[PDB]
Amino acid sequence: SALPELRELIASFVSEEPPEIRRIRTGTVPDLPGSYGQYFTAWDFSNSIVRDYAMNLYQLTRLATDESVSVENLLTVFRTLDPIYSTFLGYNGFPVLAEYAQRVGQPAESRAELLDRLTTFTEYVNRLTAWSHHYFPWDLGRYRYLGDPSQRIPVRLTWQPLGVQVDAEIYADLNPQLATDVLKALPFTVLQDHAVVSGESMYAWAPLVSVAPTPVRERIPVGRLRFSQATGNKVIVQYGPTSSPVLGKVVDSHADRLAEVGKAVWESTFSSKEPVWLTVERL
Amino acid sequence: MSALPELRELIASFVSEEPPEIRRIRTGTVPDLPGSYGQYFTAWDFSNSIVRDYAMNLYQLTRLATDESVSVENLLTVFRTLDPIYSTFLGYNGFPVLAEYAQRVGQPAESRAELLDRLTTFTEYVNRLTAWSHHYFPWDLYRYAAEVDSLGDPSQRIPVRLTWQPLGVQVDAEIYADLNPQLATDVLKALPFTVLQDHAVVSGESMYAWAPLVSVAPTPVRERICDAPVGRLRFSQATGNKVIVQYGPTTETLSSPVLGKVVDSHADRLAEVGKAVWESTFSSKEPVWLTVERL
Numbered sequence: 383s384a385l386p387e388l389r390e391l392i393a394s395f396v397s398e399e400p401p402e403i404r405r406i407r408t409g410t411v412p413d414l415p416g417s418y419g420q421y422f423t424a425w426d427f428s429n430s431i432v433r434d435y436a437m438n439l440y441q442l443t444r445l446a447t448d449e450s451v452s453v454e455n456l457l458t459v460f461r462t463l464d465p466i467y468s469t470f471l472g473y474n475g476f477p478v479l480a481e482y483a484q485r486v487g488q489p490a491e492s493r494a495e496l497l498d499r500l501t502t503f504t505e506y507v508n509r510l511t512a513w514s515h516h517y518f519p520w521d522l523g524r525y526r527y528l529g530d531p532s533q534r535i536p537v538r539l540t541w542q543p544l545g546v547q548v549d550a551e552i553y554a555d556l557n558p559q560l561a562t563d564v565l566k567a568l569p570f571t572v573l574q575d576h577a578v579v580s581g582e583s584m585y586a587w588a589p590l591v592s593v594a595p596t597p598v599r600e601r602i603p604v605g606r607l608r609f610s611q612a613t614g615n616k617v618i619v620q621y622g623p624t625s626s627p628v629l630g631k632v633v634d635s636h637a638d639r640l641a642e643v644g645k646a647v648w649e650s651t652f653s654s655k656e657p658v659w660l661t662v663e664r665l
Numbered sequence: 666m667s668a669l670p671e672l673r674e675l676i677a678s679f680v681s682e683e684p685p686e687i688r689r690i691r692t693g694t695v696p697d698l699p700g701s702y703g704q705y706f707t708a709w710d711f712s713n714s715i716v717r718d719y720a721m722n723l724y725q726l727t728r729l730a731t732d733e734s735v736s737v738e739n740l741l742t743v744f745r746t747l748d749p750i751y752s753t754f755l756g757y758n759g760f761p762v763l764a765e766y767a768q769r770v771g772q773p774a775e776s777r778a779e780l781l782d783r784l785t786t787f788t789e790y791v792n793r794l795t796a797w798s799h800h801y802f803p804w805d806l807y808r809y810a811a812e813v814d815s816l817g818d819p820s821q822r823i824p825v826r827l828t829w830q831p832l833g834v835q836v837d838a839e840i841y842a843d844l845n846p847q848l849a850t851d852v853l854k855a856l857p858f859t860v861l862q863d864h865a866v867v868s869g870e871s872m873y874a875w876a877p878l879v880s881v882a883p884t885p886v887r888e889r890i891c892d893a894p895v896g897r898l899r900f901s902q903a904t905g906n907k908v909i910v911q912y913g914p915t916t917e918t919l920s921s922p923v924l925g926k927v928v929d930s931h932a933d934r935l936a937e938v939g940k941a942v943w944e945s946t947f948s949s950k951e952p953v954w955l956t957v958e959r960l
């Protein structure tokens with residue numbers, strides 16, 4: 383890559399919580415982000431902007447593949463759209479993120495040069511989002527209401543804390559480039575957090591950044607596996623009712639084993655902050 | 666001049682009237698019932714945060730349309746790539762209308778100005794939704810450990826008045842066309858306007874209001890918020906084209922264009938309005954209004 387240290391950080395952050403995230407949830411943020419003797423707002427500003435910024439980073443990355451857009455032209459779009467987001471995160475608990483954003487805007491000798499710079503920093507901010515999504519205290523709501531049987535690839539999903547294991551197939555002929563990439567990042571262990579809005583689903587931020595085409599997408603089948611590129615290269619498992627691309631599905635027999643993992647990854651995300659880890663592997 | 670006249674009619678109505686989409690988020694009457702486990706606070710958390718940052722996206726894309734170093738088929742593809750993931754979520758999270766106008770802003774445009782009007786109008790429609798959203802959002806829910814104007818020609822400074830009602834507090838201020846010619850005139854052109862006044866939640870003691878205008882004019886005089894005097898007046902193009910009054914010490918370090926300052930005689934009156942607009946944003950949700958008029 384153009385800056386190797388970021389990949390080093392990426393590898394450490396799938397296993398460990400970023401010191402930055404640590405400082406924000408604790409209220410140790412330097413420059414005391416927050417107004418009137420509280421830091422909750424600054425924390426809400428940290429989680430939101432790191433997420434949407436991530437979404438922008440990812441779309442800018444997709445944009446960097448379009449050759450109907452100049453490389454310096456894309457440089458300008460980033461130079462316009464980025465500082466308003468980076469500078470604030472610099473002040474609100476995301477300083478090193480700023481320095482790298484200043485770096486993606488540096489002149490690229492190759493279209494590949496920007497594309498790689500984006501992908502590293504995107505994945506780095508996408509990890510940061512994931513951890514931010516893990517620790518934000520959403521528990522204040524007060525607010526109470528086809529294919530080929532040959533191309534299915536055998537995979538195993540496991541939650542060490544829960545001790546639950548499931549088998550599943552990845553359809554490598556429905557979304558070909560998408561499955562290729564996810565497969566290449568298998569085996570991986572990541573954190574498993576819950577979906578706070580759409581419903582009884584969960585997602586885990588995969589260790590990849592793919593702009594792969596998504597010709598086959600579906601309604602957001604119990605135990606469905608879907609990969610959301612736009613929202614952070616997340617692998618998504620559906621243990622209940624809640625259009626995203628389809629990677630495959632957990633076997634109907636181990637479909638009943640998801641429910642207790644659903645409750646435990648919902649409490650993982652809502653109240654406990656007690657990590658549920660997901661390992662995906664190829665059998 | 667306008668290819669979105671009905672958006673303009675919405676923009677006028679919402680300066681005074683709470684928007685309906687915002688009403689459904691704060692009461693919890695949204696047809697998707699967004700959120701999980703039977704709560705809306707997270708959906709609330711997501712529509713507010715995303716509508717704010719969706720507006721920052723629209724504004725930098727309005728800023729991009731004024732750039733002629735970027736073709737418009739290239740501008741439109743950028744808009745066609747960044748917008749959908751935000752707006753469609755806004756379509757699901759309480760903002761159906763914003764989603765459709767978003768489909769319309771990205772249609773092929775015969776003239777740069779055609780795209781530029783779309784962005785400018787749309788920016789302002791979202792900027793008022795963000796505005797009411799920042800007012801009604803429940804921040805009352807994590808506490809910390811307690812333990813420049815010399816430049817330019819005063820001969821050109823323009824006096825204006827700021828009145829906050831139903832408080833009835835009045836202070837006299839000056840705008841400096843010398844410091845920021847286009848920025849100052851843009852706010853002076855918007856004058857007079859009476860808008861909702863809210864407090865700023867992160868940058869110390871400071872309150873801002875969504876000025877009913879979208880200025881893309883680059884600013885030649887910025888100042889660090891933390892090194893900014895009591896009474897200072899700031900215009901944030903990027904965070905909603907708002908008018909921002911510094912009434913206390915601010916933690917932020919991010920430069921903001923200088924618009925002018927409240928006169929030394931009446932700066933005392935600022936301390937009492939801040940405490941008030943604080944709860945106006947944090948607790949009561951009592952609609953303070955700021956009227957600015959030329960003197």
Ligand SMILES: N[C@@H](Cc1c[nH]c2ccccc12)C(=O)O
Pocket residue numbers: 576577578579580581613711715750751754
């Ligand atoms: N809000 C969804 C996730 C999601 C889907 N699309 C999005 C777009 C933007 C932000 C978040 C999302 C959840 O947490 O259940």
Ligand SMILES: N[C@@H](Cc1c[nH]c2ccccc12)C(=O)O
Pocket residue numbers: 431466467470865866867868869904917919
């Ligand atoms: N600190 C501001 C918010 C803010 C300032 N600069 C920003 C840049 C991007 C996003 C948000 C902001 C407040 O008090 O609310």
